[PDB]
């Protein structure tokens, strides 16, 4: 399954890792957590040659993020770098900024999903898109 990606980060050496280590500086643009949300995730991608959308990106970010805090951890970025470098046929959709679902996924809050009521999470459905 995803043993090629998860193991990828393990294949990287102190030097190879330094490539992405310093990259964060340009990605997060200087942060204490050293993480990047779906919004910024698009700015870092467009640099790799692919300028996808924040709505389509949040899809993988929500799955890659166990806590689904709405951001990407330093380690989470690695697995994405190996999984993306393989499937670069999904890079398209420039001139984008924010998306209803893009930011929504962040407001959802993995912890909020069960904050009030769960049955009230799939009660009102009108095409999420």
Look up residue 7 and give its two tokens. Answer: 């193991």
Q: Which of 123, 6, 126, 124 minimizes the C-alpha distance to 64?
A: 6
The answer on whether 59 is annotated among ligand-binding residues is no
What is the number of H-type helices and E-type strands within the chain?
8, 2
The answer on whether 38 is annotated among ligand-binding residues is no
The answer on whether 76 is annotated among ligand-binding residues is yes
The answer on whether 117 is annotated among ligand-binding residues is no
Alpha carbon distance 64, 123 (integer Å): 26
What string of H, E and C letters represents the secondary structure of 114-129?
A: HCCCCHHHCCCCCCCC
The answer on whether 69 is annotated among ligand-binding residues is yes
- Binding residues, as ranges, are 65, 67, 69, 71, 76
- Binding residues for Ca(2+), as ranges, are 65, 67, 69, 71, 76
């Amino acid at each position: 399954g995803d043993d090629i990606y998860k193991a990828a980060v393990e294949q990287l050496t102190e030097e190879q890792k330094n490539e992405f280590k310093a990259a964060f500086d340009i990605f997060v643009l200087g942060a204490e957590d050293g993480c990047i949300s779906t919004k910024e995730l698009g700015k870092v991608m467009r640099m790799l040659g692919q300028n996808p959308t924040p709505e389509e990106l949040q899809e993988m970010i929500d799955e890659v993020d166990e806590d689904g805090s709405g951001t990407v951890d330093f380690d989470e970025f690695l697995v994405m770098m190996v999984r993306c470098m393989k499937d670069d046929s999904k890079g398209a959709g420039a001139g984008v900024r924010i998306s209803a679902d893009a930011m929504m996924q962040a407001l959802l809050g993995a912890r909020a999903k069960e904050s009030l009521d769960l049955r009230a999470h799939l009660k009102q459905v009108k095409k999420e898109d």
